Amino acid sequence: QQQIQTLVKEGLRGFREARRDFWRGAESLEAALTHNAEVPRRRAQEAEEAGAAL
Amino acid sequence: QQQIQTLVKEGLRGFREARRDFWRGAESLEAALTHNAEVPRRRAQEAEEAGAAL
């Protein structure tokens, strides 16, 4: 109960919080790499905002 | 015919060329201060295009 219940129970948790946050972090990047890029080639002020999002 | 006929006919001639050009230039600048200024406040690509025109 000390070691092995505790290691299952709350010893893997912040590793699993941080991992899921990291992958969220790339999901969010994946979407924001589309948001940067979907601006018309003639346009520049929308382009600097879209680049800023990224 | 030397002096007064010449002066009347073509002694004021380069001054008026120069005048009519200047007055065109300040007409074009008067409209272009307006072209520079009919840009919505949020916008940035129209605003930088407009500022080159001024």
Side-chain angles (χ1 to χ4, degrees), chain A residues 42-47 49, chain B residues 42-48:
Chain A
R42 49 187 174 271
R43 306 300 291 190
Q45 297 307 332
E46 292 70 31
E49 298 175 356
Chain B
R42 291 161 199 245
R43 295 178 176 169
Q45 297 195 252
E46 192 170 66
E48 283 311 89

Side-chain angles (χ1 to χ4, degrees), chain A residues 6-53:
Chain A
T6 305
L7 176 63
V8 70
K9 167 161 147 290
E10 68 191 22
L12 313 175
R13 63 137 277 285
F15 154 99
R16 290 168 174 188
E17 288 161 41
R19 174 179 171 233
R20 208 30 61 227
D21 178 28
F22 167 75
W23 286 118
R24 183 54 178 145
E27 178 183 67
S28 292
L29 182 66
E30 286 285 336
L33 291 160
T34 295
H35 291 308
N36 155 69
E38 294 304 343
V39 158
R41 174 52 192 65
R42 49 187 174 271
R43 306 300 291 190
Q45 297 307 332
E46 292 70 31
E48 281 305 70
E49 298 175 356

